[PDB]
Design a protein around this nucleic acid. Structure first.
Ligand SMILES: [Zn+2]
Ligand SMILES: [Zn+2]
Ligand SMILES: [Zn+2]
Lengths: 103, 71, 211, 345, 129, 173, 148, 228
RNA sequence: CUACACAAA
DNA sequence: TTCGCCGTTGCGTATTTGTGTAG
DNA sequence: CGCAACGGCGA
């Protein structure tokens, strides 16, 4: 996001002609270089699960409806660990209430 | 609305002892103490009434609802 | 049942005379030539792999559409360690010079090596398919004999006669949809065991279970 | 919702649902009192004090009451648990309020609106705090090098406070569901709150996992609670194909019987009053609350001349004559006089 | 597009940022923040959210062309009144826009926070999370 | 609460939990949700709907009219023979509606001001659920219901309108 | 119909002398085809008959509520302890001929319901004349209109 | 002699002497059979569908081996050893593995038939002679229901995120959580097993309810396209 | 006759 | 200039039976 | 609810 410094609004990209001109509705421009040259991108199945389920994975040990298994928490030394099976690839995450988050 | 005059299945006259059975059963349940009352065995009571060991006759004797108990 | 064959969908396709593009359960049964060789499962599996359609999007780990141009130049800071293989490509291909009218656009594609090996596809095959199908682009590639393969596609000038962003995005879409291998319209191609009858030299009609 | 009761034919299959036997419909609660209590809670930060940046930077949890966002709390789970305990006490929070905690978006939702389905569920308590304390003690023993660290661990206990004495008192009329709720033995759970509940389907299952620390039930159910009144008429319904239980729910409601107890004072149309009714020899709990319609016919499962094939039945003419399923059908003829023009004669 | 299915308003898909503008908080970055909850935050969640919000802002509305880039509340509110007295429209808007949030002038920033939360939830469902 | 380790339950059978089912059904009453909802309606909701939501204040061309209803009361159903009570069986037989009178008192303000107060009056009749707090059989023994031609073993929950009995459904929303 | 959902239409009514009877004189009220069971899986009715056979002899009414613990082996042993066979089957004689069946017949009390579908209400027969529609000139619709 | 039996005796009688003769022969043979059963007698009893304790233990062992294979698949999932084929996700491959693992072996009939006397079992004789019922009917009644499949897949987690029912925890791995019924009808299903069976039965009822309208519209269109 | 509701196969 | 698109309209969504209720 | 003309305006 390129926020106009005068009116606090989104600026268009307007790649005219050989460079990048951050044209705004009010008229102010910043131009900019380097990072602002990535027009678009798409990344195929790289970075998921933990990022979008961060809240749920944090809350999992405290949800009583989550499954538990009988194995030790190395950090915490309980006998039980909360088991999560998230996504279409069925990633198994063992998480403890102390903070253990076996990846 | 009452215990039938004769057994619906074979025609044995259980209505002869219908009233005696009703009141004797109320008495016999009272000394034996809604669901626990139904599980009290009435084999001896019905046999003493003279009714034979017939599945149909005892069925219709003990299961028929009395309208006077509901209205 | 399961390729939507649930309900009246296939009978509705049949009875309503639905067009080929409106079918949800299209299938073909293809026999190998030389009925002496249609008895080896490995050869049939190789042919099945060879005919299944593969587009460019299935070999791409990720792609980036950059405004940067190249000169035989301003470059994106993130993909700055690419100049080594750009120099290597330029020195190893003295016949494919950068366009004298190259446009200020680029497409940096990261190739999935695991998918490429799992499909027996080579970098040369991909580049040859891209150049033939998309003449008004200038493909630049890293070295396959290694860090992942990087491909840079620069629109020449002719893709533009809509803002240049829109033309570049549609060119990205066209490149990602370009078929690398296989015949169009073939999602999958699995090998099936066929029961067929055949007459021998003795004139007996035998049921061949091993087709 | 009764998982069995539905139409067995036509477009009305699964269209008209039936309340389960213990299911109730909530009335509107004191939303304003709970809102005042929440906004006076030191644990809840007001909407005008915390910004959207603080909600994600500090991991604040949005608190809703009747769908209205009223603030944020430091930790959603503790707030929901504290208010669940307050509801269990029953004084400050009405027992019929819904306290829901969404673990996927970190939100606590309170619901007190009309139309919520509720059912009472027996609460299952455990010693998980003491279990964890024993685990930490055993870990400390292992760190110290003790060769008998196992004796520090205590077995896990999970159980309900419902006891057979309370069952006897319930059957004896001394104990009621209100006393069960006030004592904290059971609580009302709404389908939204039910998503926060891990329920043992039976006391048998609760007893099976009594010492299982990996199955920590929040409630224990009574399996008959998943059926409606008409579905419970069917005996040994779990031994019957469930579609036939649906068939019975349909047929159990067209059965002739004492359609009304005040029939002689009613001019009813197309109403059938069957004289003789019997309690089933094998009754179900549905007959504690509704009158049984039908008779305990003696049935021979046999081939007799091929007159009972393809759902036909051979009946005893004598059983018909004696009054078996006999009754009175009633019709009515209501004719208005319109105005002074018409008269009866 | 945010549509209010009230009596006076119907079939009129006001852009979300325009509705945010009519209730104050003219800062467009602040309007985006009302949906993403953290403007200067990493992770692929906020980036995808913000890119969608960019596209939603930078699209020609076929029926809200004049006020699409307008930055004062007056012109947008007057356009809304034409399409459907400034303080009359803005007061009749809060009686139909999230009444459970409140119907008074004070409850407007919280109404916008709730609207941004709703848009955030919808766009989260768009992620297939 | 005591501890969970010392709860004696090993002799709690599956037929003992049917007692919990019985406790639940006896508490609700198997019909009680909708009778309670109707009682809540004509105890608080109808007064809420009338006292609130109706304090109209409009200005016409200029002239302004303001009037609100301050008191609302619904009575048990009545009949014309000196306002004799309408029993459910009489309504069913005669084809009447088992509707209870609604009484309203309204004060008009015009603005000069003219504070006019209207005495309480019958505004309409509201249909009455059988067994509701405004039904004539609400607090009645089974015998007392029998002498008035009523079913003693039925819980009510329905409406008598033009002689027929009607069930207002539980709509899914 | 029974409480397990097994609908049936009364096809034949037999006098008391024509109905089959057990060795001890028990005869049915209804004769239900065994072919109604195997596809419909209404084992609850079968178990209810087995339980009610012993209930009638003991003079009790027991609870057959769903999901209560059930042991069909113990119920059959209860039948045996009551003085009957392990199965509820008995030696039956044909009422019309007096000849015993070679197979023991399962007979017992099964609670049955009379569904309020009366053939006297459902049957309809119309002759060549009656009320017709004014517009189409066709007969009116159905029994209610006295033609159709 | 069955109805709709191509090449049966009545079809041959019709081919050689006419369909009216076939109808008369159907009536005559039906009278012969009914008059025979007038003396032979036929019945079905609750004991006809009861397994011996040994057969019950054998069925329990078969079901335990099925659940053991399912638990092995779950253990493989925990270790990340589930590697789907191309075109299949790990979730879909795991579901296929669980569906195949929980299938009843064809030897489930051995305990059923060890408890059955084929000469006197009315239920078995109805099934085996083609009069009524099928082998799955006998297996469901006596041995066990097995896995409940709706649209050729297990019970989907519809209750909540990763939950099939309020009785099973989130992301449960046991087969029972997704519609595997270890009980038979004679043994009596538990509450969640009955819920899954009710799901299946309701699905069948809905299918029967809506197929009528779809097929009726198709039939009318075909009739009007073909009637000329 | 036009809704609508409850049912049957 | 010849086609896609897109609201925008219509059409249609098993059969035969009963009973009500009202307008 | 879906399906299919359609006919008027963008290409
Ligand atoms: Zn600007
Ligand atoms: Zn830990
Ligand atoms: Zn008898």
């Amino acid at each position: 996001m390129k926020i106009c410094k005068a009116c606090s609004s989104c600026m268009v990209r307007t790649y005219v002609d050989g460079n990048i001109i951050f044209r705004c509705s009010c008229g102010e421009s910043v131009q900019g270089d380097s990072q602002n040259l990535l027009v678009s991108s798409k990344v195929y199945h790289t970075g998921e699960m933990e990022d979008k389920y961060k809240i749920f994975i944090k809350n999992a040990p405290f949800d009583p409806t989550n499954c538990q298994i009988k194995k030790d928490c190395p950090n915490c030394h309980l006998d039980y660990l909360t088991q999560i099976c998230i996504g279409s690839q069925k990633i198994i995450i063992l998480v403890c209430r102390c903070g253990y988050m076996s990846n | 609305m009452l215990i039938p005059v004769v057994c619906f299945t074979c025609g044995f006259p259980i209505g002869t002892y219908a009233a005696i059975f009703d009141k004797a059963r109320t008495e016999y349940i009272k000394t034996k103490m809604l669901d626990a009352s139904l599980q009290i065995e009435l084999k001896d009571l019905i046999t003493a009434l003279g009714i034979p060991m017939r599945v149909c006759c005892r069925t219709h004797l003990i299961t028929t609802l009395d309208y006077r108990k509901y209205y | 049942r399961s390729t939507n064959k649930s309900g009246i969908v296939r009978p509705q396709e049949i009875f309503s005379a639905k067009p080929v593009e409106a079918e949800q359960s299209s299938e073909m049964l293809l026999r190998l030539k030389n009925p002496e060789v249609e008895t080896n499962k490995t050869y049939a599996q190789e042919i099945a792999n060879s005919i299944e359609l593969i587009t460019f999007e299935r070999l791409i780990l990720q792609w980036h559409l950059l405004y940067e141009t190249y000169s035989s130049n301003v470059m994106y800071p993130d993909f700055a360690s690419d100049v080594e293989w750009m120099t290597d490509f330029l020195e190893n291909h003295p016949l494919l010079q950068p366009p004298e009218d190259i446009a200020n656009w680029c497409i940096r594609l990261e190739l999935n090596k695991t998918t490429m090996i799992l499909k027996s596809i080579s970098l040369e095959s991909i580049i040859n398919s891209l150049r033939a199908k998309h003449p008004n682009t200038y493909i630049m590639h890293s070295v396959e004999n290694t860090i992942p393969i990087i491909i840079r596609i620069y629109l020449r000038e002719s893709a533009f006669r809509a803002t240049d962003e829109k033309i570049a995005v549609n060119v990205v879409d066209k490149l990602l949809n370009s078929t690398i291998r296989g015949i169009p319209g073939i999602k999958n191609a699995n090998v099936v065991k066929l029961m067929r009858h055949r007459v021998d030299a003795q004139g007996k009609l035998v049921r061949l279970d091993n087709i | 919702i009764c998982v069995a009761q539905s139409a067995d034919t036509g477009e009305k299959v699964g269209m008209s649902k039936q309340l389960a036997i213990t299911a109730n419909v909530c009335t509107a609660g004191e939303v304003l009192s709970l809102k005042q209590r929440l906004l006076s809670d030191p644990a809840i930060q007001q909407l005008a004090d915390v910004s959207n940046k603080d909600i994600v930077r500090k991991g604040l949890a949005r608190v809703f009451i009747n769908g209205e966002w009223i603030g944020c709390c430091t930790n959603a789970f503790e707030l929901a648990q504290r208010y669940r305990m307050l509801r269990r006490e029953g004084k400050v929070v009405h027992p019929h309020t819904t306290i829901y905690w969404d673990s996927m978006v970190d939100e606590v939702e309170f619901w007190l609106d009309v139309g919520r389905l509720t059912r009472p569920l027996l609460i299952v308590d455990n010693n998980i705090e003491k279990y964890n304390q024993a685990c930490y003690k055993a870990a400390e023993a292992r760190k110290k090098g003790d060769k008998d660290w196992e004796k520090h661990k205590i077995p896990f206990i999970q159980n309900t406070r419902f006891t057979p004495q309370m069952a006897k008192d319930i059957l004896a009329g001394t104990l009621t569901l209100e006393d069960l709720v006030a004592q904290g033995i059971c609580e009302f759970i709404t389908p939204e709150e039910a998503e926060n509940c891990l329920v043992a389907f039976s006391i048998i299952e609760l007893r099976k996992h009594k010492h299982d620390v990996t199955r920590r039930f929040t409630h224990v159910d009574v399996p008959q609670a998943i059926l409606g009144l008409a579905a419970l008429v069917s005996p040994y319904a779990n031994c019957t194909q469930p579609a036939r239980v649906t068939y019975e729910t349909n047929q159990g409601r067209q059965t002739g019987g004492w359609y009304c107890f005040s029939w002689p004072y009613r001019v009813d149309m197309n109403r059938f009053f069957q004289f003789y009714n019997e309690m089933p020899l094998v009754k179900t709990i549905a007959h504690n609350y509704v009158i049984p319609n039908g008779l305990n016919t003696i049935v021979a499962y046999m081939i007799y001349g091929g007159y009972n094939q393809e759902d036909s039945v051979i009946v005893s003419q004598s059983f018909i004559d004696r009054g078996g399923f006999a009754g009175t059908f009633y019709r009515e003829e209501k004719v208005e006089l319109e105005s002074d023009i018409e008269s009866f004669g | 597009t945010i549509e209010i299915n009230s009596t006076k308003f119907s079939k009129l898909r006001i852009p979300w940022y325009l509705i945010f503008r009519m209730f104050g908080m003219t800062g467009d970055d602040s309007i985006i923040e009302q949906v993403v909850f953290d403007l200067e935050s990493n992770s692929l969640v906020n980036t995808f959210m913000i890119e969608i919000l960019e596209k939603s802002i930078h699209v020609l509305d076929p029926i809200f062309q004049p006020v699409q880039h307008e930055l004062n509340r007056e012109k947008i509110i007057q356009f809304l009144s034409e399409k459907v007295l400034n303080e009359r429209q803005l007061t009749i808007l809060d009686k139909i826009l999230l009444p459970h949030m409140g119907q008074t002038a004070d409850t407007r920033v919280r109404k916008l926070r709730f609207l941004g939360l709703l848009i955030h939830k919808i766009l989260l469902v768009i992620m297939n999370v | 609460y005591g501890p969970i380790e010392t709860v004696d339950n090993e002799e709690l059978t599956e037929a003992d939990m049917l007692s919990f089912i019985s406790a639940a059904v006896n508490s609700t009453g198997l019909i009680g949700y909708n009778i309670k909802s109707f009682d809540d309606l004509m105890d608080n909701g109808i007064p809420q709907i009338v006292k609130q939501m109706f304090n109209v204040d409009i200005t016409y061309k200029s002239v302004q009219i303001q009037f609100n209803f301050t008191d609302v009361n619904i009575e048990r159903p009545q009949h014309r023979n000196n306002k004799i009570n309408l029993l459910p069986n009489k309504a069913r037989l005669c084809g009447l509606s088992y509707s209870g009178p609604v009484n309203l008192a309204a004060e008009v303000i015009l603005t000069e001001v003219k504070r006019a107060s209207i005495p309480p009056f019958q505004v309409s009749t509201f249909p009455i659920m059988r067994g509701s707090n405004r039904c004539h059989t609400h607090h009645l023994s089974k015998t007392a219901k029998k002498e008035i031609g009523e079913d003693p073993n039925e819980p009510g929950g329905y409406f008598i309108a033009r002689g027929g009995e009607w069930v207002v459904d539980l709509l899914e929303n | 119909s029974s409480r397990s959902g097994n609908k049936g239409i009364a096809a034949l009514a037999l006098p008391t002398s024509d109905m089959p009877f057990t060795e001890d004189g028990l005869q049915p009220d209804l004769i239900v085809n065994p072919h109604s069971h195997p596809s419909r899986m209404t084992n609850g009715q079968m178990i209810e008959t087995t339980v009610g056979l012993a209930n009638a002899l003991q003079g009790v009414v027991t609870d057959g509520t769903a999901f209560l613990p059930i042991n069909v082996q113990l119920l059959s042993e209860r039948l045996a302890q009551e003085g009957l066979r392990f199965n509820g089957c008995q030696k039956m004689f044909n009422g019309q001929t007096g000849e015993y069946f070679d197979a023991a017949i399962f007979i017992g009390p099964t609670y049955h319901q009379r569904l309020q579908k009366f053939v006297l209400d459902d049957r309809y027969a119309v002759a060549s004349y009656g009320p017709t529609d004014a517009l189409t000139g066709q007969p009116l619709d159905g029994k209610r209109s006295h033609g159709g | 002699v069955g109805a709709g039996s191509s090449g049966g005796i009545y079809h041959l009688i019709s081919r050689r002497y006419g369909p009216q003769q076939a109808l008369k022969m159907i009536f005559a043979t039906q009278q012969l059979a009914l008059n025979y059963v007038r003396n032979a007698g036929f019945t079905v009893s609750t004991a006809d569908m009861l397994l011996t304790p040994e057969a019950h233990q054998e069925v329990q062992e078969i079901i335990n081996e099925l659940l053991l294979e399912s638990e092995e698949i779950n253990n493989r999932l925990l270790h990340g050893d589930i590697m789907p084929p191309i075109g299949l996700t790990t979730h879909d491959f795991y579901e296929k593995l669980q569906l195949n693992a929980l299938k009843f072996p064809d030897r489930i009939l051995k305990p059923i038939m060890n408890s059955i006397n084929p000469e006197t079992n009315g239920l078995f004789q109805m099934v085996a002679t083609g009069a009524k019922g099928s082998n799955p009917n006998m297996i469901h009644i006596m041995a066990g229901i097995g896995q409940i499949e709706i649209n050729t897949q297990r019970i989907q987690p519809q209750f909540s995120f990763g939950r099939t029912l309020v009785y099973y925890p989130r992301f449960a791995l046991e087969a029972q959580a997704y519609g595997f019924i270890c009980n038979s009808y004679i043994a009596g299903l538990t509450s969640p097993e009955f819920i899954f069976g009710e799901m299946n039965g309701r699905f069948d009822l809905i299918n029967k309810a809506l197929s009528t309208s779809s097929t009726g519209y198709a039939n009318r269109k075909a009739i009007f396209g073909l009637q000329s």
